[PDB]
């Protein structure tokens, strides 16, 4: 009897996993999993929401990532009588269980949430996170906006560390434009990028034309790992599988 709008691909996938599929009426553009979600109306991008697009779906509940913007839109939706449930957005392996908890509590499925958490925790524990001497550079890019490198306090940094690797970029937080000297000094062994990042550059071969990139170990061997954006950076249920693959890629080298 509820009508749920879910915002954040991590959140949507969790809500489906807890059995709420029948009640989900719309989602945001970052929500493409499971495949059923793709058939639902799309209310806008998580970071550029508008109230009308959500209210048009006549929701009773909005399950929304803390990463959603603008915050004013959430306030407007709550004022309209919709139950707005914020889901934690911390980009850490500990955070996934808190996300499951938040959604399970809202859906009155605490028991199923506890089981999903137990499973996630065991899958995460099984990934080898012991340090490996491999440096990874993550590049974030847009359709025409300057390509950037991720430093600390980013989702990409957290994933690299959780797989036992080292971020090639050190000493700054969030993102900085790529420079030839900084990229060369960072000397990454592996280039990590999302599918949308490749789309913005046009092709994978354009990665190797970025500043300094051809003059790094990664560039010398065109060593790369391209991952779906929400799987790589979203900190959802598939986080252990992504970490296991990142670990394997670092090991094979
Ligand atoms: Br977004
Ligand atoms: Br990131
Ligand atoms: Br490769």
φ, ψ of residue 20 to 5 degrees: the values are -90, 5
**Backbone angle region of 176, left / alpha / beta, with phi > 0 → left and psi within -120 to 50 → alpha:** beta
CA distance 137 to 118: 32
Q: Is 248 exposed, middle or buried (0-12, 13-18, 19+ CB in 10 A)?
A: middle
In 3D, which of 232, 161, 235, 221 has the Cα closest to residue 192?
Answer: 232
Task: Tell me the two tokens of residue 6.
Answer: 């879910």
Cβ neighbours for 250, distance < 8 A, ≥ 6 positions apart: 132, 134, 136, 163, 164, 165, 189, 190
CA distance 22 to 244: 32
Separation of CA 30 and ligand 2 centre (Å): 14
Give the number of other CB atoms < 10 A from CB of residue 168: 27
Task: Tell me the two tokens of residue 3.
Answer: 């009508």
* Closest ligand to residue 30's CA: 1
User: What are the distances in angstroms from CA 148 to CA 12, 20, 97, 141, 198?
Assistant: 28, 37, 30, 6, 13
Q: Which CATH superfamily is domain 122-253 in?
A: Nitrogenase molybdenum iron protein domain (3.40.50.1980)
CATH 3.40.50.1980 in the chain, residue ranges? 1-121, 122-253
In 3D, which of 154, 208, 157 has the Cα closest to residue 183?
Answer: 208
φ, ψ of residue 135 to 5 degrees: the values are -100, 130
Q: Please report the resolution in angstroms.
A: 1.5
Q: Are 174 and 154 in contact (CB under 8 A)?
A: yes
In 3D, which of 147, 138, 136, 244 has the Cα closest to residue 190?
Answer: 136
Separation of CA 221 and ligand 3 centre (Å): 7
User: What are the distances in angstroms from CA 109 to CA 23, 89, 115, 149?
Assistant: 14, 20, 10, 40
**Backbone angle region of 187, left / alpha / beta, with phi > 0 → left and psi within -120 to 50 → alpha:** left
* Closest ligand to residue 249's CA: 3
Q: In this structure, what DSSP letter does residue 44 have?
A: -
Q: Which CATH architecture has domain 1-121?
A: 3-Layer(aba) Sandwich (3.40)
| Experimental technique used to determine this entry | X-ray
Q: Give the helix/strand (H/E) hosting 62.
A: strand 61-65
* Closest ligand to residue 69's CA: 1
* Closest ligand to residue 70's CA: 1
Separation of CA 242 and ligand 1 centre (Å): 20
CA distance 50 to 73: 6
């Amino acid at each position: 009897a509820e009508r749920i709008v879910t915002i954040g691909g991590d959140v949507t996938e969790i809500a489906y996993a807890l059995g709420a599929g029948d009640e989900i009426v719309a989602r945001d553009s970052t929500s493409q999993q499971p495949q059923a979600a793709q058939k639902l109306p799309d209310v806008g991008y998580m970071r550029t929401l508008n109230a009308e697009g959500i209210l048009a779906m006549k929701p009773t509940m909005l399950l929304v990532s803390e990463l959603a913007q603008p915050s004013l839109v959430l306030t407007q939706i709550a004022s309209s009588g919709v139950n707005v449930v914020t889901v934690p957005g911390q980009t850490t392996p500990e955070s996934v269980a808190m996300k499951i908890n938040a959604v399970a509590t809202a859906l009155h499925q605490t028991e199923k949430g506890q089981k999903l958490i137990e499973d996630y925790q065991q899958r995460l524990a099984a990934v080898n996170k012991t340090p490996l001497p491999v440096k990874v550079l993550f590049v974030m890019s847009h359709g025409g906006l300057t390509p950037m490198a991720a430093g600390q306090n980013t989702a990409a940094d957290a994933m690299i560390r959780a797989a036992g690797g080292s971020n090639a970029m050190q000493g700054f937080s969030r993102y900085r434009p790529l420079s030839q000297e900084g990229v060369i000094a960072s000397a990454p062994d592996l280039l990590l990028i999302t599918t949308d990042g490749v789309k913005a550059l046009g092709s994978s071969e354009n990665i190797w034309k970025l500043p300094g990139m051809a003059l790094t170990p990664a560039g010398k061997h065109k060593r790369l790992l391209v991952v779906d954006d929400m799987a790589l950076l979203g900190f959802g249920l598939e986080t252990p599988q992504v970490l296991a693959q990142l670990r394997e890629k670092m090991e094979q080298m």
